[PDB]
Amino acid sequence: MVLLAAAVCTKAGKAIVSRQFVEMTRTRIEGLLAAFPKLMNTGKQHTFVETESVRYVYQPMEKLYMVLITTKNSNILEDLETLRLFSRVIPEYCRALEENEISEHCFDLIFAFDEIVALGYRENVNLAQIRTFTEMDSHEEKVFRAVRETQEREAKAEMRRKAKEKEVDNFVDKLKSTKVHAPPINMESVHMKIEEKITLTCGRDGGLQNMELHGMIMLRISDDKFGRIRLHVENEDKKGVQLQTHPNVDKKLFTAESLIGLKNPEKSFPVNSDVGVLKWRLQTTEESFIPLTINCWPSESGNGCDVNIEYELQEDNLELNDVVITIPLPSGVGAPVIGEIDGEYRHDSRRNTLEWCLPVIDAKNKSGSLEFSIPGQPNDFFPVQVSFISKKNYCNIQVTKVTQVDGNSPVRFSTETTFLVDKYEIL
Amino acid sequence: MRILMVGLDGAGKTTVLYKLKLGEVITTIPTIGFNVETVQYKNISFTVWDVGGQDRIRSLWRHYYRNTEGVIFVVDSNDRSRIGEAREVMQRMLNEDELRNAAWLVFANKQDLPEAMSAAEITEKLGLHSIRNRPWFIQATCATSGEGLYEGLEWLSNS
């Protein structure tokens, strides 16, 4: 909108016709306006008066006034054109001038407001053309003849059926001139969470169908004092893991120096927001990479298969806790009988699983075995699922120290490192 | 004449209609409202209200309570469902008196579309068997069939 009403006026103290774009109130807004207009306020001449931030815009055209109203700023000329423009239009629209003609072509006239002006926007040119748009059309006709006809044919036929059936700059310059430690309490102002997840699928044969390792270092700083720092990364890893630095982080610095810092050292890391400064990925078929191999050998003694399963820790570096090897069992057969075992077990009748737990798997104690018997087939035993958590990362990557960009002083920091299993399965 | 197509329209009750009117079919959302056509014969031009017997629309038709002149009942001949229930309603038409100013046609539609009843079977079932103070010859259509319809009708305007 740029006009809540256009009212076309005659001298009478009264505006000859009007339309209310928006209703709510009563005429008293409009009614009051009408009264004021009729009164003119005795005021002598002048085709414009705005008072009290309300434009009362008018044009005498004769004994007639055409009126528009507005309150906040506008570009004048445009406006004028319109008043004037009105003064071009009418003898066409409603016929000449005398209220009556208009009285007959009221509908036409109101229609013209809308048509002309869509909410304070100068819609077009060309009056005749303006006629054109509606109650003067074309499409409808085109459609009608064909259609009406078609139907008509059906009808006709029916009748029978029935019947029978540089510069910028100048300015510019001038101008210019398990739980992890949860609360912040138990963390240093510089804190990093290094988390890795492993997705691994192995055949029962022991072949490695797929291994995927993903890891990242999440940095969180609680105090702006710590904002410009560099992380010292120690990388022991032989595996051929691919490392990628955050887009903000200086890639070259990391490559040569093995330090994590922002491209612009002046910039500060965000405060109280996690940033993944570094990420790494490893995807490989090589069995040598398997952290913990599982060998399950079912064999069917006559009536009553015996299952022997063992594990061995490949990477001496890891220390695995809460290791659970889940083995599915046949149902209806009763509980499994447990023979020699390293560690302990839990039998779940509902789940039909045998969970083998522990012992702690260290470099010192690489392997262990479990033997049990239940009536079943070798297939009943797979897939085996392995679950564990490790405090130490699979990839030998660690943040040894953190230093200030300016002065390179050492800074206290804390780290939470976890190695988790997304999926570790033996087909 | 005011001729009435009622029942819930959208089923092709409306199809039934659109088929008459253009030859076409329901290419509308299933239609609760008045559908209007004038069909000219004996140049009584029959103004057809194809109106869904859906809830309101059934409920509310009082301005259309005036005085009838023609009856189409457009039928799901797979419906054999709401008809007893219908019979139960239908009485109130019977209990209307405007309603006794039409020699009519129930049209059994939707025959191909699953099946249909004995012409008789239905006849008692809507309660139809029982009239006479209006004529009551019976005519089956389908909605992918129907002929001789017009015999039914023939008698009807010429009642």
DSSP element (H, E) containing B50: strand B44-50
Best mutation site among B17, B19, B22 for testing chain A: the one with the most A CBs within 10 Å?
Answer: B22
Q: What is the largest CA-CA distance in chain B?
A: 38
Q: What letter represents residue A133's amino acid?
A: F
Contacts of B147 in chain A (CB under 8 A): 161, 165
B6, B58 Cβ separation under 8 angstroms:
yes
Resolution at which this structure was determined, Å: 17.3
Provide the CA B16 distance to its chain's centre, in angstroms: 10
Give Rg (Cα) of chain A. Answer: 43
A277, A341 Cβ separation under 8 angstroms:
no
Residues of B at the annotated binding site for GTP? 8-15, 31, 53, 109-112, 143-144
Instruction: State the smallest CA–CA distance between residue B37 and chain A in angstroms.
Output: 12
- Judged by CB atoms closer than 8 Å, whether chains meet at A161 and B150 is answered as yes
Q: Backbone phi, then psi, for A285, in 5-degree steps?
A: -85, -25
- Judged by CB atoms closer than 8 Å, whether chains meet at A151 and B23 is answered as yes
Non-local (6+) Cβ contacts of A165 within 8 A are B147, B148, B149, B150, B151
Q: Is A340 on the interface with B (CB under 8 A)?
A: no
Non-local (6+) Cβ contacts of A186 within 8 A are A414
Q: What is the largest CA-CA distance in chain A?
A: 122
Question: Sheet containing A5-10: which strands, arranged edge to edge?
Answer: A17-20, A5-10, A64-70, A54-61, A48-51
Q: Is B44 on the interface with A (CB under 8 A)?
A: no
* Residue A170 CB neighbours (<10 A): 9
Provide the CA B148 distance to its chain's centre, in angstroms: 16
**How far, CA to CA in Å, does B54 sit from each of A184, A419, B31?**
64, 63, 9
Q: What letter represents residue A127's amino acid?
A: L
Non-local (6+) Cβ contacts of A259 within 8 A are A230, A231, A232, A233, A253
| Gap between the Cα atoms of B35 and A105, Å rounded | 33
| Gap between the Cα atoms of B78 and B81, Å rounded | 8
- Judged by CB atoms closer than 8 Å, whether chains meet at B149 and A154 is answered as no
For tokens 């009608």, name the residue: A144
Method for structure elucidation: cryo-EM
- Judged by CB atoms closer than 8 Å, whether chains meet at B149 and A158 is answered as no
* DSSP reduced 3-state for B66: coil
Non-local (6+) Cβ contacts of A218 within 8 A are A192, A193, A194, A195, A274, A275, A276, A277
Contacts of B41 in chain A (CB under 8 A): 162
B22 vs A154, A164, A165: nearest CB: A154
Provide the CA A363 distance to its chain's centre, in angstroms: 46
* DSSP reduced 3-state for B42: coil
Non-local (6+) Cβ contacts of A137 within 8 A are none
Q: Is A321 on the interface with B (CB under 8 A)?
A: no
CB neighbour burial string for A178-217, b if at least 16 within 10 angstroms, e if fewer: eeeeeeeeebbbbbbbbbbbbebbbebeeebeebebbbbb
For tokens 């259609």, name the residue: A147
Measured in residues, chain B has a length of: 159
Name A333's bridge partners: none
Cα angle: B113, vertex B118, B124; to 5 degrees: 115
Instruction: State the smallest CA–CA distance between residue A144 and chain B in angstroms.
Output: 13
Q: Tokens for A102, please give them.
A: 């208009």
Q: Which of A236, A247, A315 is nearest to A279 (CA)?
A: A247
A226, A190 Cβ separation under 8 angstroms:
yes
**How far, CA to CA in Å, does A329 sit from each of A27, A295, A348, A382, A386?**
85, 16, 10, 8, 15
| Gap between the Cα atoms of A292 and A201, Å rounded | 12
**How far, CA to CA in Å, does A86 sit from each of A30, A79, A118?**
21, 11, 15
- Residue A73 exposed, middle or buried by CB count within 10 Å (0-12, 13-18, 19+): exposed
| Gap between the Cα atoms of A1 and A118, Å rounded | 7
Name A61's bridge partners: A64
For tokens 């009164």, name the residue: A39
B33, B60 Cβ separation under 8 angstroms:
no
| Gap between the Cα atoms of B138 and B146, Å rounded | 12
Q: What letter represents residue A172's amino acid?
A: V
Q: Backbone phi, then psi, for B42, in 5-degree steps?
A: 75, 10
Residues of B at the annotated binding site? 8-15, 31, 53, 109-112, 143-144
Instruction: State the smallest CA–CA distance between residue A136 and chain B in angstroms.
Output: 25
